[PDB]
Design a protein around this ligand. Structure first.
Ligand SMILES: [Cu+]
Length: 67
């Protein structure tokens, strides 16, 4: 697969982590997602990084790919 790391903004509580995890899981192609709450980071494996960041932004959070 391919794996990307995202730096997120706007997570304020566990419900935010859940919303983001759900937004990512509704993206066709995604295989796996983990969120680091304190650091506002996600690691996502998928089968379109722009697809992922766009989904997170639609859920109401900022997202950028880390390189
Ligand atoms: Cu929240």
């Amino acid at each position: 697969a391919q794996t990307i790391n995202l730096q997120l903004e706007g997570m304020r509580c566990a419900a935010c982590a859940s919303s983001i995890e759900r937004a990512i899981a509704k993206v066709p192609g995604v295989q796996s997602c983990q969120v680091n709450f304190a650091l506002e980071q996600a690691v996502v494996s998928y089968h379109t990084p722009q697809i992922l960041t766009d989904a997170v932004e639609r859920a109401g959070y900022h997202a950028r790919v880390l390189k």
